[PDB]
């Protein structure tokens, strides 16, 4: 089988206060 | 020239979403049941000193019914290699039949489409569906699915409906257990290299042939790996009243004399079953 | 007592392996035993060996070599229950049928397998025979088997052996178990070895017998069965030809001119009478040899297929190759010491005269006590 | 691993005085073994890389 990636969730914190 | 008894097969079933649904058994292939649409309002808060009353408005009692659908197939042989074989084709080929039925019944009961197949609760699309918000990253508005959503979804179930389990593909659970906070600590199972609580206590039954939003476990999502918003992630329902699975007769195998032309011994198998969605208010769907 | 350390660990090191549940008989042997049941001579011998053992009568009884004054008849009610179950096994099956099945399996594969349902106090409730072809066994780590698997996918009852099972305070098990009696072989490997059946040495003869019977059945239909190849000449007037042919033909039994002479006026037609021997199509000589060989390998005097030969077949092949091993397997793990399952030799109709003669000649003797005169011809006490 | 990769053993080690080529003053020993291995179904395993 071809080498498949293993992308996992990053640093997920916010949904409404996006920085300046 | 030293044939073994090793029979490596390496094929997989699903889990079984069968012991959850309410089980009912019927003898004949046509059942019928009643339903209470609404009790309606009867009597108001009338005033005093009024020799009268009001008839209100009566309720409603609907009368429903559903069929049972059949499942059949055919397989055969040549009767020449079956006498000389170094195996037993029938005991293998018979074993190949429920494995096809057991997996076809479960999926159809889940995603069946109308005619001659029980309408699954996915395609019914009367379970209320809850879609999650998207997130921001570097200005981009990629869709995501955080642990904050999962607790919100499972808790938002109406308490008076009863206790309800959850169903989801294990790749979602691996996605949940592997989440990371800002610093780098894990959210669940802090510092034990693995997070695996007893699912029966968190009332989360697991399966493997659900839509699996993390395609091949390769769409965690930061750039072009976004969850492709509009995909199923998990479901939650009081299954003992939200969906029923009816059973009439288990599978049967009967030789077909006639059609067997002295070369091709042809077996025949079949089974009858069915299903239908009950009150599809107990039960909600999480979506991206 | 039991040391739990047998010298049979030579295999589980590398040469065998634990916890895989290997089958007990090769599929080649299974198919050979299957096809010997449709083969004419093989099936004939297999069913005869069955009937005989199927005839002998069972009971439980005191053993003669009772040096164990501490008799293993733990309750004497387990013995009545064993007697009951030996006379009537699991419902819808009798003791004669169970004996027949065991003998057929022992003749085909060199194995016997049973399953017991002892209730809670050494009282066996029922006994079932097991299909050897589809029974697998799984070994322990030291030297022997621990579990039997019966079925591939759904049937997965891991029956424990008699060696490992919840025993009573005396020693008798409490839960279900199985036997797996085996026939010994070369190079040890009491359970890890290859089977020992007559089928192992009758492959070539059965193949030759099948080839000869196929040749015979082929040559039966296909060889012209007519006589009198008659030929006319190349100048005879089609029509004069047909007339001479009809004159020749219409002498069959029930014809116009039957049995009378044939007169031909010129144009000599030539007849030659074909032999059509057809009297050796099956090759009697190299067929009866193969029949005798496939009988001798199962152990049956050829004469049976005269009373001396019957006695010999009963007391040289039937008894110490089917009766004693099954009886000793049952005695090993079906009851305690001092008591065991025995078959009454006087129940065979062929040995009665021999027994009577020996009893008369012993009664004639005087320098021998009565109890030993009895014991030398059965009759315990 | 019980089903993802199988180990094959035919004949373990063996030591024996190689009679022939050994004289009354010098011995020549010969040892040997016979083993093997293959993969079963290789959809049962997995590998982690960088």
DSSP result, C212-267:
HHHHHHHHHTTS-----EEE--S-S-TTHHHHHHHHHHTTSSSSTT-SS-----SS
Residues forming beta bridges with residue D30, ordered by sequence position:
D16
> Which SS3 state, helix, strand or coil, does residue C79 take?
helix
- CA neighbor of C192 nearest in space, from C180, C203, C201: C180
Instruction: From chain D, pick out residues whose CB is under 8 angstroms from the CB of B6.
Output: 6
- DSSP per-residue letters across chain B: ----S-------------SSSEEEE-SSSEEEEEEEEE---------SS----------EEEEEEEE-EEEEEEEE--SSHHHH-SS-HHHHHHHHHHHHHHHHHHHHHHH--STTS---HHHH--S-EEEPPB--BTTB--B---HHHHHHHHHTS-GGG---EEEEEHHHHHHHHT-B-SSS-BSSSTTSS-----TTTTT-EEESSS--SSGGG----SSTT---SS-EEEEEE-HHHHEEEEEEEEEEEEE-TTT--SS--EEEEEEEEEEEE--TTS-EEEE-
Residues forming beta bridges with residue B249, ordered by sequence position:
B272
Residue bearing tokens 């997995």: D46
Phi, psi of C198 (to 5 degrees): -60, -25
> Angle between the C27-36 and C95-109 helix axes, to the nearest 10 degrees?
120
Instruction: From chain B, pick out residues whose CB is under 8 angstroms from the CB of D41.
Output: 8-10
Interface test with D, best of B1, B10, B218 (most D CBs within 10 A): B10
In degrees to the nearest 10, what's the CA dihedral of C227, C228, C229, C234? -160
Partners for D (CB, 8 Å, 3+ pairs)? B, C
> Which SS3 state, helix, strand or coil, does residue C18 take?
coil
Q: According to the entry, how was the structure determined?
A: cryo-EM
How many Å apart are CA C167 and CA C182, to the nearest integer?
23
Q: Compute the Cα dihedral for B93, B97, B99, B104 and give only its sign.
A: positive
Decide: B4 and B97 in contact? Cβ < 8 Å: no
H/E stretch holding C73 reads none
Decide: C98 and C121 in contact? Cβ < 8 Å: no
Phi, psi of C376 (to 5 degrees): -70, -15
Cα C233 → chain centroid: 65
- CA neighbor of B21 nearest in space, from B202, B272, B247: B247
Q: Compute the Cα dihedral for B217, B222, B225, B228 and give only its sign.
A: positive
B11 at interface of C, judged by CB pairs closer than 8 A = no
- CA neighbor of B133 nearest in space, from A12, A6, A8, A11: A12
Decide: C95 and C89 in contact? Cβ < 8 Å: yes
B216 at interface of A, judged by CB pairs closer than 8 A = yes
> Which SS3 state, helix, strand or coil, does residue C49 take?
helix
Phi, psi of C135 (to 5 degrees): -115, 125
- CA neighbor of C126 nearest in space, from C165, C155, C159, C86: C86
Instruction: From chain D, pick out residues whose CB is under 8 angstroms from the CB of B10.
Output: 3, 40-41, 43-44
Contact across the interface for B8 and D43, Cβ inside 8 Å: no
Residues forming beta bridges with residue C272, ordered by sequence position:
C229
Taking the alpha carbons at both ends of chain B, their separation in whole angstroms is 57
Decide: C89 and C133 in contact? Cβ < 8 Å: no
Residues forming beta bridges with residue B169, ordered by sequence position:
B207
How many Å apart are CA B17 and CA B109, to the nearest integer?
9
Q: What is the resolution of this structure in A?
A: 4.5
Instruction: From chain C, pick out residues whose CB is under 8 angstroms from the CB of B5.
Output: 22-23, 27
Count of beta carbons in the 10 Å neighbourhood of residue C112 = 22
**Distance from B191 to chain D by nearest Cα, in Å?**
21
Burial of B281 (0-12, 13-18, 19+ CB in 10 A): middle
In degrees to the nearest 10, what's the CA dihedral of C304, C309, C310, C316? -110
How many Å apart are CA C240 and CA C267, to the nearest integer?
10
Count of beta carbons in the 10 Å neighbourhood of residue B172 = 23
Q: Cite the beta strand spans of chain C per DSSP E.
A: 22-23, 58-62, 111-112, 114-118, 124-129, 135-139, 145-150, 157-160, 177-178, 181-182, 229-231, 270-272, 339-343
């Amino acid at each position: 089988a071809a080498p498949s990636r293993l992308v996992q969730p990053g640093c997920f914190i916010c949904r409404g206060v996006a920085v300046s | 020239p030293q044939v073994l008894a090793l029979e490596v097969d390496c094929n997989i079933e699903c889990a079984s979403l069968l012991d959850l649904y309410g089980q009912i058994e019927v003898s004949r292939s046509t059942f019928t049941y009643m339903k209470i649409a609404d009790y309606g309002q009867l009597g108001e808060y009338t005033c005093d000193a009024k020799c009268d009353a009001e008839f209100g408005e009566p309720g409603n009692i609907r009368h429903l019914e559903g069929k049972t659908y059949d499942y059949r197939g055919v397989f055969c042989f040549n009767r020449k290699n079956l006498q000389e074989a170094n195996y037993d084709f029938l005991s293998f080929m018979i074993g190949a039949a429920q494995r096809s039925h057991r997996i076809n019944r479960n999926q159809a009961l889940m995603i069946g489409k109308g005619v001659n197949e029980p309408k699954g609760w996915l395609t019914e699309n009367c379970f209320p569906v809850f879609q999650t918000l998207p997130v921001d990253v570097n200005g981009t508005s990629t869709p995501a699915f955080l642990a904050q959503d999962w607790r919100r979804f499972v808790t938002s179930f109406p308490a008076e409906y009863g206790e309800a389990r959850s169903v989801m593909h294990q790749n979602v659970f691996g996605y949940l257990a592997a989440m990371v906070d800002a610093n780098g600590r894990f959210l669940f199972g802090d510092g034990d290299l693995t997070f695996t609580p007893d699912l029966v206590r968190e009332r989360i039954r697991i399966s493997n042939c659900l839509p699996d939003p993390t395609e091949g476990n390769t769409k965690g999502g930061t750039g072009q790996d976004a969850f492709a918003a509009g995909s199923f992630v998990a479901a939650q329902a009081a299954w003992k009243t939200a969906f029923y699975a009816v059973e009439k007769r288990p599978m049967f195998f009967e030789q077909y004399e006639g059609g067997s032309s002295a070369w091709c011994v042809k077996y025949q198998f079949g089974a009858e079953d069915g299903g239908f969605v009950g009150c599809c208010e107990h039960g909600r769907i999480l979506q991206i | 007592p039991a040391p739990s350390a047998n010298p049979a660990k030579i295999f589980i090191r590398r040469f065998f392996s634990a916890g895989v549940a290997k089958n007990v008989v090769s599929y080649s042997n299974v198919m050979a035993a299957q096809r010997a049941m449709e083969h004419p001579v093989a099936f004939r011998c297999l069913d005869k060996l069955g009937l005989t053992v199927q005839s002998v009568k069972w009971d439980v009884g005191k053993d003669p070599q009772n040096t164990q004054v501490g008799d293993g008849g733990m309750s004497a009610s387990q013995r009545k229950a064993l007697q009951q179950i030996l006379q009537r096994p699991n419902p819808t099956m009798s003791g004669a049928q169970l004996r027949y099945s065991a003998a057929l399996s022992w003749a085909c594969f060199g194995r016997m397998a049973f399953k017991v349902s002892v209730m809670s106090d050494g009282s066996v409730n029922a006994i079932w025979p097991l299909g050897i072809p589809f029974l697998k066994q799984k070994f322990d780590r030291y030297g022997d088997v621990e579990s039997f698997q019966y079925g591939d996918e759904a049937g997965k009852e891991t029956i424990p052996s008699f060696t490992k099972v919840e025993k009573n305070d005396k020693g008798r098990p409490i839960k279900n178990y199985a036997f797996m009696i085996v026939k010994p072989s070369i190079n040890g490997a009491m359970n890890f070895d290859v089977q020992n059946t007559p089928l192992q040495a009758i492959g070539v003869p059965v193949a030759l017998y099948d080839a000869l019977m196929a040749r015979a059945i082929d040559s039966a239909d296909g060889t012209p069965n007519s006589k009198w190849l008659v030929t006319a000449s190349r100048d005879l007037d089609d029509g004069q030809a047909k007339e001479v042919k009809e004159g020749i033909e219409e002498t069959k039994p029930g014809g116009d001119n039957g049995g009378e002479i044939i007169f031909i006026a010129g144009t000599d037609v030539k007849v030659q009478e074909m032999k059509n021997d057809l009297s050796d199509i099956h090759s009697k000589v190299p067929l009866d040899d193969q029949a005798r060989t496939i009988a001798g390998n199962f152990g049956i005097p050829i004469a049976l297929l005269y009373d001396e030969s019957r006695k010999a077949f009963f007391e040289d092949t039937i008894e110490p190759g089917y009766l004693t091993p099954l009886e000793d397997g049952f005695s090993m793990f079906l009851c305690g010491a001092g008591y065991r399952v025995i078959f009454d030799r006087d129940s065979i109709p062929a040995l009665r005269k021999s027994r009577a003669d020996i009893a008369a000649t012993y009664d004639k003797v005087t320098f021998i006590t009565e109890e030993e005169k009895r014991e030398v011809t059965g009759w315990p006490a």
